[model samples]
Target: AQNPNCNIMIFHPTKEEFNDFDKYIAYMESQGAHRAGLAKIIPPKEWKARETYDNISEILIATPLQQVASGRAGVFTQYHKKKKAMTVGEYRHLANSKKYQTPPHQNFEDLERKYWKNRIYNSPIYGADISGSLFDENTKQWNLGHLGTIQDLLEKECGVVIEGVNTPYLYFGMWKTTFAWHTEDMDLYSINYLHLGEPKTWYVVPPEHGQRLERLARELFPGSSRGCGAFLRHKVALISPTVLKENGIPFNRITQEAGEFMVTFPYGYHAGFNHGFNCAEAINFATPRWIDYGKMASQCSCGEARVTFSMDAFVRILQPERYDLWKRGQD
Candidate 1:
């Protein structure tokens, strides 16, 4: 089993090394890894050159959010009110009543609408469509277009491929708004690059320590359900660049071009926000059938629940051919 303590592996490549992006393609092929969005750029043998390139920083560690005896109820309340205009009392009552937690309603439209409004309020030039997941939840299955864009940008601008390593590509779009806390069922590795605004805040805990975090989350917000925890396995906080530095968290600040970080999780507890900032970010991830850690997949048998909450089926509807590609790892 993989070590439970290790949850992420981060890499930072220099301008020149990243610029010579063909080396990244060669490395992936050498590892028998498949590209997610575009065609492979180089063959396996040439990948070894990647080591000779400078400007690479790799980080391997556990989820970094600090835990309190109780959850941050006030924060959740403020977040909901600011973003959704819904009071914590009302959200709790509705959630406890189990009135709108099922399919269709539970798909994330309410959340998306709030973010859309926030974006419009923040920047006129930036806007996004949550319809990809709304129109056909199962068929859309995250942001393949964003993945393709990332590949193109890296190749054209930096000359490297940000590998996802069997990771699922979740939400992708401009970040003029905020995303709340929730957990995910699958094991995931996420890398995000921020072009404008503040750094994203992430709250996380190990799967073994999940119960504590869940209990705190529940106590802080009574009406919140449990499954959303599975959807937001990693808590990301969107703090202004100013606040991030002031907070004293151990993070590398990239200001020149873009900011990026990667997270590898196995049933880890987490959350995030897009605090005040006009931001654009991309995510690359995979939903593992099993956790590499000692935990058994049966321990979190919520695959059906995830499918019910995801756009995997929607992908099947809109792009049936691409849906097959998604399943076969061609995407």
Candidate 2:
């Protein structure tokens, strides 16, 4: 008999143990934690820093599309909602208010349906650059830029620093606000720190099951799949764990609390929603093992437009003299 299952490994690393980030990952890899697709790290108790979202003044409102009245499973065509803008304080007030009550559902599947139908996507401010901005106040201990050794390869080797990729991006979330299933850009590894506020629920599909999840997404949203080979990047669909199990996809669930860190492994597909108001910062990074995945990463296309980052450029800088030889190996 064969069974498909995944368990999220939680690492409790002391300040000293966590200091050597790559070394810790090596240990985790040896223990086969990478096979789980995602890992939770509880940093030393002393790692909390000042909350950054308070200084920002405004946030973007996210309005999710609802299912059509015809009621097709996995289909969302009617969005009677409208996008709006609000001050951070106002949004926070709304996020904290008890005006919205969660609807009753019989199971995870029904809950997901009610959520898609009625939940408010009132708060999700994405890619708010922290460089020189008021939100730049972050601790060096868990800062994505300073955490791991191999993560610096992008900037140190390529001589270019990419914001939101090499540098971090601030994210704000409210209850029921979701991040659709997707892999990191360029299939790079990602680390997200829940700086403050409520727990975030995360669901991850291991690298071996990544394509299976994609196939399910394409089947669920055929029109979007037809529109873009990288339709998942658009971040507009939600599938319950029940549905995933029914489809025979393996996944692990994680509840990430404030002051903890969550790492998404290369080629892992992840998606989840916030329990309530929360602040998180995340950035993409790479380890040496990522080079192969990077080289194989396809150009993400949406009709005529495409998104891609050149791994060859970094490889050239890493082995300037031997790059020609390395390039020949590909041929």
Candidate 3:
């Protein structure tokens, strides 16, 4: 009998040399050994190479609004009022809720990244953003960790990329810094690394159960019966794990710690909170399984989005190399 409690798998880090990033890749491929094909990887060597992160992280914690704007980093939670951000009776807690009535997108980027600065010179509000826009191709920071090398392997083998946008969303949070429940854009894979600070909790609704969750959402918020509720289009009320569980939906909890890697597959409905002040960085990848999911999920998006590398574009990139991998089917 399949043990219902068998939901999570944790892998401790290794002391093996990371020559050519093989150690990291081997750990990922060894997920099956951990019993869960999608397990969280924990570093065995505590405080080993941990300090290297500090040099770069100083820039993340102390970087100013002007520098972020100058660096073209995407800011969040700074401005604007979300109409559907809350339910009908709950709008009174925020400002300008009456004037806007139905919010333009239910999600907006109006929160001035500056105003929230004084309110929190420490804990960044929901609108703060520190993504790839700050760490461009020229940024040497990528070379400091396993992620940079991982990026190389994914692209070299599977055509994964973020170009100028997407990938490497540097999240800074305190208390309730949230990411609103949603799937990885383009239905691709994402691996997030919490660099430092407090552990964060994550809720995952496996792909198989996604449809069921959606159906439940429609009934609860009938008005949001449009797209992937809390995930895709029109009116997303980012529900907590509590909501999913109360509905009898299947899901799992992951309290991710620093130096750990959390991997989410295509179409995984994952969302979570920073228990306290924390920092995390995540990037997306396109693998063999990604082609089909990317095609399907992109079509589901409200408008043109994340799948910047079109079906035709990605196929072309994969090229003659793909035929071998597809036919060989990974040994």
Candidate 4:
């Protein structure tokens, strides 16, 4: 069935609008783009795409085995349990291996062969800091810590550049490699910019549908859900789009090309697989509106091993400044 409502909102901003990041993002929110959980922004056509990076051998890559052989017809039940470190070039060869080709349809024998043959999934350069790198020197929009971006507020409070939060992370994605459904750490807003390569397919569930999606995931995997209250936090478990549609869960699918930005709202549940080899940079940020969500997420006893940043410390410093400003205004 065809549904026009399933499409994601895409915005094309003028140079002036794009430069004013805060105001522009607010404008997008006003347009109800945030309600979709994710939106796409295409920079002015004049802006050139950053197509290449230097020093491939120096960068480390995460090789995770994804079980995508079943395609979208089945569910991925667990987190990617295996990972190995390799140089960017080394992973590229494994990812580009032509030994086995995917069959058009799923059959018992084809499934088993493809599953074993395509054992290596997405080999990504996960969460590598961009600071002091050549990429950082060349771009403003892609680097999250540029004071004009949303991370500025978090950095101002934290007093140091936080890696993967205020700091930007470089990601390398190859075909069939996927990021399973999960919200940003601390429930903060995240922006992902595709620097180069083929398009990526994204599935986003609006904040309102977040609970429904989680419930479905729990229904589908009762044992896993019971074992980990924060099972979603593990970055495993993918429910297909067809299954989502079957359950009456609303979602949007977006095709992100090179030089485009995909912005995920606070607590937005999103997951997607890469179309092919691509490089992307992403980072998490918090605005004043995010404090409440951050507080709630911080309070959750989800048994997460680590947090991206400290919400208590941010609020502790922020409260006094707000109180002082209010007092000054009163006089």
Candidate 5:
């Protein structure tokens, strides 16, 4: 009955909003949001960062560029085809064992330990499989099913429609280098969530002022690719339980256990940081049909890949009848 394509909105839960599970449901019903089930929150250790270029180079000595680029995915298929006799775990361990002798310029371990100690863990509260449904086996790729479901549930229970969802795997050990100051994709309606640790400092500027933010960062944290989208510090919504305000810096505390809140960004420019705290949060990605090139390509099997709206995906899964509405657009 409702127009499925609604503008993007963020919802943050206060104590009253989550007074009871049914109350939350009533809120979502009024907001046009959906209800995703309880997600398995994992500790940080289980998820390791991708190896860096320097570390990857070591393996390159023996493996080719294509092999190194594709990593285990490539090897898995090859071994499967050849029946060469190596288990996925064995291959993964062998690949991971090749570490970088030279230290990274940015000490991610120290940073991660300092800010994200409590936020991250090696395994989920239940187990890895609990969070595994998000991955599409037929497509041999992963989507934000976990986060999307959560967003849907929030919509259903809170009566709010989430515009987008993003979970950047930009953590220590996952990449060779840390990110320079940059916000999430700015073209779409979006909300970037800070999990685990915060940054030392953040800069904010006006909308359509991407270059200005870059220049400011160059002046301040030069050569730091940390700022995303607008350069504004925006407002801080703390979704963790730990007391973060006393540490200095203004932030709206939305206790992790409380669920979500509705955040409105009237001004386009804003950014912030988590100096260090075990961070776990999700950004309601605003851009519709946008795909992360690296992630999409990494998981692409036959090149028939395309980015679908998270809402669209959610609708298709829950209400098959809605498929006709989506198909009508093609007509």
Candidate 6:
């Protein structure tokens, strides 16, 4: 609330406050925040970044950390594509086994920070899942479901919604692992709830300047692929907040503690790093103003063109004005 015109906002929440502080969640969710993450775990937004991830390192790395840091589950996940990536299951076997020998820079502790203080975060990564997802149990929402997901919030006071195509994503972050700068796809809004874990440092710039940064990066860096990707042949090119500030652009930094929320607005330029090992939940939303952008986003992004059925589905959810049907679920 301190900087309304600013693209980002931070909210501190307390335990026993708002019955899990879903009220604030509902409020931020309603605004269609571009990028928001919740802090504090169960008590006072209480979270220890890795209490549950005990002994992940063989006293060194995390179970989930091992996966992202090593999980080679996807085809593109390999190093340089021509190289291969590690699987989380492999870490499970190698973590304590005598047969496995880690490198000298093996101690994962005090790792990401030293790396970030020098340069960008470039390494194998992993994350944890929180909130299941605001969508279906396991699949993408049906073509028809997206409309209802957007409509469900009209009458009901929704902090966030579950069960839709474009819903929240679970994240488990470790030091130095970075999300490069970029706007949310299709001009959508996102909410991130740090269920527990370390503080995530955020660098958010307003919409007015976001495009300028993109343009400058392009003219100067040449095909960084929407961000600092050009700086590396590998790793998500996470542009340093230090770099942005040095460029004479204004930005805000927040240590966003647990039991807090970090909300980002549309067209905002945002990049961040996990102070240490952490976990956060993120979801996307589209307020009423989104319809126009949805069309624009479709034009800008390169993807499949199919029947969105925009009017057909919304007709069922809103034609009757079912806004009053929202029922509160108990925590």
Which one wins on TM-score?
4
Candidate 2 matches the true fold with a TM-score of 0.73
Q: What's the CA error at residue 270 for candidate 4, in Å? A: 0.5
Give the alpha carbon lDDT tens digit for every residue of 99-199 in model 2.
53234457555555565555443333322223321223456555575654343566665455543324566666666766768787667888888877877
Q: Find the 10 residues in a row with the least total lDDT in model 6.
A: 322-331
What TM-score fits each model? Answer: 0.37, 0.73, 0.58, 0.75, 0.26, 0.54
Higher-scoring candidate on lDDT, 3 or 5: 3
Q: Which lDDT tens digits does candidate 6 get at residues 1-331?
A: 4234443444444544434333554555455333332212233334222334443323222234432222211111212112233333443353324422222353433433354453222343544333233223332211112333554543353343333344455665655545556566544555565655556777666665665566555554454445323222222334454566667666665565554445555556676666555556665555655544434431211121111233223323332232222111000
Compared with the true structure, all predictions reach lDDT values of 0.31, 0.64, 0.46, 0.63, 0.27, 0.43
The CA root-mean-square deviation of candidate 3, after full C-alpha superposition on the true structure, stands at 12.4
lDDT of 3: 0.46
**Candidate 4: lDDT over CA atoms?**
0.63
- Candidate 1 matches the true fold with a TM-score of 0.37
Return the lDDT, model 1, position 161.
43
- Across 138-187, the per-residue lDDT of candidate 1 in tens digits comes to 22212223333323333354344443222222222123233434334333
Candidate ranking under lDDT, highest first, comes to 2, 4, 3, 6, 1, 5
Residue 41 CA error for candidate 5 (Å)?
Answer: 20
What is the Å distance of residue 195 in model 6 from its true position? 1.7
Estimate the TM-score for candidate 5. 0.26
At residue 319, give the lDDT of candidate 6: 29
* Model 5: CA > 4 A from native: 1-13, 16-179, 189-201, 208-211, 214-274, 287-331
**Which ten residues in a row are the worst by lDDT in model 4?**
125-134
